[PDB]
Amino acid sequence: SGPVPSRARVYTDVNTHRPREYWDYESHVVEWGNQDDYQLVRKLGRGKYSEVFEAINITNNEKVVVKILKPVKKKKIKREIKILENLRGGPNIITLADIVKDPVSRTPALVFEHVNNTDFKQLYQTLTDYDIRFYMYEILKALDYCHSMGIMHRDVKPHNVMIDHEHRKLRLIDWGLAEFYHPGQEYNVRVASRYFKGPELLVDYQMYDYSLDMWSLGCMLASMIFRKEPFFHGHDNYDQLVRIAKVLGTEDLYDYIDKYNIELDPRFNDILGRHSRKRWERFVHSENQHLVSPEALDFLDKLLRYDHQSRLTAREAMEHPYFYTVVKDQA
């Protein structure tokens, strides 16, 4: 028979209770601003679906970030715009300032608030135990808010986390892969970058939910406290699952497959092997021990579970002893 269905443990029907317009992005009508309000200053980078620039809004002298899109299905641009508008003003969510189009080229561009970011390949190695808890807590506020609003980010990784360390300011960006959660919906598993993909994506289990973001968050926490980037270093999507199995063990994986009646791709049989569940101590050493504590390991263990239903929710994660000092300092 086929796979056993699943439903999100929390915020299951928040979209069902909303008016259709909230989540039916295919019928969203884009509100366009004036492209002449912005002047491109410099290129920040490119990508498969966009080129991004730093720009100046000449009507108020505000520094902005402009993401000029390459050909993308209009429903997907509508999805990103709709999600950004629904989440506007939410804790640590990037602000979509404007949406403009080149009148000649017909090329759309999304205009975002600017964050004076310090690239993670320099910032992360300088972070203290307290910095890691503080910033993890800030990401959790962004995830609990978007999940409570019926949205999964589906692309949580260091590149999508903008940090202005001088001002202790964090923003979760790039909502281009984000989706609305609907109970019973089967989603595309070809989402997220390889190292952050949850087991549900790797075994082709389509009835996933917000908990997908908690796995990616666990991958980020592990890379930060162990200074091991990436934490699960797969050569491809098949080997990515092997890398997780070598840490979490094959027994919990096969119990996960059996529980949801998942048909495993036959390629997996001869590569998964048999592996015991390792203890987190084998990743601890003299140069990372200052970031590792029993509460960091307890929290990590509760995020990195094969069974998406058994991972902490963003709200349960925020109540973890790992954040007691951050919570006390914010009060």
Taking CB under 6 A as the binding criterion, the range among 16-24, 81-89, 115-123, 288-296 that sits at the site for ligand S92 is 115-123
Q: Which two three-digit tokens encode residue 115?
A: 């964050």
Q: Is 198 annotated as a binding residue?
A: no
Determine the distance from the C-alpha atom of residue 42 to the mean position of all C-alpha atoms in its chain, rounded to a whole number: 27
Closest to ligand S92 by CB, 219 or 248? 219
323 φ, ψ to 5°? Answer: -105, 5
Which among 84, 56, 77, 53 has a CA at the least distance from the CA of 66?
Answer: 53
Closest to ligand S92 by CB, 68 or 262? 68
Please tell me whether residue 15 binds ligand S92 under the rule CB under 6 A: no
Shortest Å distance, C-beta 298 to ligand S92: 32
Q: Is 38 annotated as a binding residue?
A: no
Judge whether 262 and 204 are in contact, CB under 8 Å. yes
CA distances from 272 to 203, 239, 267 (A): 12, 8, 9
With tokens 């390792």, the residue in question is 278
Please tell me whether residue 56 binds ligand S92 under the rule CB under 6 A: no
Alpha helices of the chain — where are they, by DSSP H?
Answer: 74-87, 120-123, 129-148, 199-202, 211-226, 237-248, 250-259, 269-272, 294-301, 314-318, 324-330
* Catalytic residue numbers, as ranges: 155
Please tell me whether residue 177 binds ligand S92 under the rule CB under 6 A: no
Residue count of the chain? 331
Q: Is 247 annotated as a binding residue?
A: no
| Mask for 132-161, x = binds ligand S92 (CB under 6 A) | ---------------------------x--
Other CB atoms closer than 10 Å to residue 221's CB: what's the count? 22
Shortest Å distance, C-beta 263 to ligand S92: 35
Shortest Å distance, C-beta 322 to ligand S92: 27
Please tell me whether residue 109 binds ligand S92 under the rule CB under 6 A: no
Q: What 8-state DSSP symbol labels residue 185?
A: P
Other CB atoms closer than 10 Å to residue 25's CB: what's the count? 20
Q: What residues form DSSP beta bridges with 172?
A: 93, 161
Closest to ligand S92 by CB, 162 or 212? 162
Shortest Å distance, C-beta 112 to ligand S92: 4
Please tell me whether residue 174 binds ligand S92 under the rule CB under 6 A: yes
Determine the distance from the C-alpha atom of residue 46 to the mean position of all C-alpha atoms in its chain, rounded to a whole number: 20
Closest to ligand S92 by CB, 33 or 249? 33
Please tell me whether residue 94 binds ligand S92 under the rule CB under 6 A: yes
Taking CB under 6 A as the binding criterion, the range among 4-12, 113-121, 232-240, 248-256 that sits at the site for ligand S92 is 113-121
Please tell me whether residue 45 binds ligand S92 under the rule CB under 6 A: yes
Closest to ligand S92 by CB, 159 or 290? 159
CA distances from 271 to 3, 5, 96, 186 (A): 22, 27, 44, 27
Binding site for ligand S92 (CB under 6 A): 44-45, 47, 52, 54, 65, 67, 94, 112, 114-117, 159, 162, 173-174, 176
Q: Point out the annotated binding site for ATP.
A: 44-52, 67
